[PDB]
Design a protein around this ligand. Sequence first.
Ligand SMILES: Nc1nc2c(ncn2[C@@H]2O[C@H](CO)[C@@H](O)[C@H]2O)c(=O)[nH]1
Length: 360
Amino acid sequence: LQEPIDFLKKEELKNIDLSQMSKKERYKIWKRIPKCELHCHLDLCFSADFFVSCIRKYNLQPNLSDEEVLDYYLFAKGGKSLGEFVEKAIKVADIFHDYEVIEDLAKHAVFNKYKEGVVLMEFRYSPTFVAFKYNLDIELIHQAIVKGIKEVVELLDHKIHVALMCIGDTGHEAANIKASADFCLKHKADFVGFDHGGHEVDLKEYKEIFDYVRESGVPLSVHAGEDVTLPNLNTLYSAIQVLKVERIGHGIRVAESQELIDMVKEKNILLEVCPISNVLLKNAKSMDTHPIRQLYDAGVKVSVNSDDPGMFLTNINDDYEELYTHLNFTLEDFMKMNEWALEKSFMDSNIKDKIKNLYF
Ligand SMILES: Nc1nc2c(ncn2[C@@H]2O[C@H](CO)[C@@H](O)[C@H]2O)c(=O)[nH]1
């Protein structure tokens, strides 16, 4: 009995010398890490090849080459801020033409995570973000995503487990947090959590909406402590103290306050760190100086996530490579962070226990 990837067992880790290896050989090791990913936006999760196929299926950029398409739409070379990312992402919504492309996107998103060695996958998406460009029905968007994920998961005999979060977001046409919350609870059978992304806002002004979702048994993980241009850390305090989140999207600015470090440790909150995203968006000065190292050393629970493989033309194993090369993270660290990720995942505990017994 065998599968394509020979996943790494924690007993085997000491026999692997990464110092011997070329980048190519390292990536074969990163692929074999049984990965649990908590923060990936399905609606911006795709390969370059998939993205360009969409643009050409609907004849959207006839005067542009394949490479010019990627430069025009995506964020692979990075930019100046989170604000610049959010506007760029709005252009990408050109591919949300119909429910068939959305299903295909979902299918290819799941399949590539499987190929990359992800065993536990919490995808998240924004109904309103997917719906606005072509005025789609969020009920049918959701139907397409659920169908695409289910079809690939069943084809793969559940060798990758996938769960879904709903994002209420700010920064695009037809954004609506309340409506997203209602939609999330309407489909709570399919959603394991609720999130806020886009522009980083102080979410205490939506206290009522988040209380209602949380109290309904849908746990919260929101984007907070990402955007370094904000003049204080109020969004982090509101996420932790008002929203009572179990996890924080990014949360890297927690590193700037000993009070917040102590608070997140005390409350067993996990920071869903997205290294490449932070660097490309200039929320970290460089990978050498990425806060994850200080946070890891400080005893804070952190995990590795890819965020937007489509926007950055990267995948999860790249984020692993960068942490190893620039910040000397080890296989033992990576295994530990993935077990934390498993523990803090919003997935059904029965499923999570099988994954734990199978890989950890
Ligand atoms: N703040 C923030 N929002 C993001 C990021 N990646 C995707 N999103 C948002 O998530 C939604 C799509 O899932 C859109 O509102 C995107 O702008 C990110 O790295 N930071």
